[PDB]
Write a structure and sequence with these properties.
Chain B: It comes from Human herpesvirus 1 (HHV-1). Chain B: This is Major capsid protein. The structure is cut from a larger assembly and holds 3 copies of chain A. With 49 residues, chain A is mainly alpha-helical. Helix content of chain A is 82%, strand content 0%. Chain A has one helix at 4-43. The longest helix of chain A is centred in the middle third of the chain and has 40 residues, at 4-43.
């Protein structure tokens, strides 16, 4: 609308994206350190052997 | 290790006076920081955050 | 849930021009009260409150902020979906 609610309700939806995109972009550097351990564990044998 | 500790002196604070007092008498709902919560929503209504 | 708010009536919207017996028609109103000279519940004040806006902060952690990036050799392709079988030769 032209009302003040319409200017306010965008911010509820726009800042909803900004909190949501940081989760997905923040997920990927986790997934680097996640998938590096699963390969290094399959590379690494235990000590006593 | 140390025998002295710097501790704050002013003990409060909450002030019901101002535009917060109007919401108490009239509406019966009052936010503690509404003196400046209604401020920041107007600049958040403008440019990127 | 109180009736008509007394602080609102302390500063009137606009003055009335006619004084009539009020109790004749009740049902043209919504909430009504009869106050003998000064009633007992006229001095009631009640309110509620919301105290504080507390959020989490997502810890934006780059992989180079970590130091497990020692054990990695990270180079990025602009295109890896077009590669089929890559390999590196080793000679000792």
């Amino acid at each position: 609308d032209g009302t003040g609610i319409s200017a306010h309700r965008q911010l509820r939806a726009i800042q909803q994206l900004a909190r949501n995109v940081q989760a997905v972009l923040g997920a990927f550097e986790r997934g680097t350190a996640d998938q590096m351990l699963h390969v290094l564990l399959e590379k690494a044998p235990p000590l006593a052997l | 290790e140390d025998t002295e500790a710097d501790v704050p002196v002013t003990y409060g604070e909450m002030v019901l006076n101002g535009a917060n007092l109007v919401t108490a008498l009239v509406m019966g709902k009052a936010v503690r920081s509404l003196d400046d919560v209604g401020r920041h929503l107007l600049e958040m209504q403008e440019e990127q955050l | 849930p109180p009736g008509y708010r007394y602080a609102a009536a302390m500063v009137p919207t606009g003055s009335l021009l006619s004084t009539i017996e009020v109790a004749s028609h009740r049902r043209l109103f919504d909430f009504f009260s009869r106050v003998r000279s000064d009633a007992n519940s006229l001095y009631d004040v009640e309110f509620d409150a919301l105290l504080g806006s507390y959020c989490n902060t997502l810890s934006l952690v780059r992989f180079l902020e970590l130091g497990l990036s020692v054990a990695c050799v990270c180079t990025k392709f602009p295109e890896l979906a077009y590669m089929n079988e890559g390999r590196v030769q080793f000679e000792v």
